[PDB]
């Protein structure tokens, strides 16, 4: 039987862990300003069909009003989880699957 007379062509990358190799949950991130024009949350709506086995969003925008821009989009088509939060001179919302 051969001992060292074997030329490997591929590498063995076995990593026994309790969590996945990477994270494909965080769908999109809208950390700018709550614009009324359909431009930012455009990803949110398009995310609905492109949905997967685990979605997430992170929006950090600033607006003088109280209405949520990005969340309003996903809420329209109706996603899985749509939540929001506020701090002070800004506001941050997030969604998941």
Curated annotation (Swiss-Prot):
<feature type="active site" description="Cysteine persulfide intermediate">
    <location>
        <position position="37"/>
    </location>
</feature>
<dbReference type="InterPro" id="IPR001455">
    <property type="entry name" value="TusA-like"/>
</dbReference>
<dbReference type="InterPro" id="IPR036868">
    <property type="entry name" value="TusA-like_sf"/>
</dbReference>
<comment type="similarity">
    <text>Belongs to the sulfur carrier protein TusA family.</text>
</comment>
<dbReference type="Pfam" id="PF01206">
    <property type="entry name" value="TusA"/>
</dbReference>
<protein>
    <recommendedName>
        <fullName>Putative sulfur carrier protein YedF</fullName>
    </recommendedName>
</protein>
<dbReference type="InterPro" id="IPR049570">
    <property type="entry name" value="YedF"/>
</dbReference>
<dbReference type="GO" id="GO:0006974">
    <property type="term" value="P:DNA damage response"/>
</dbReference>
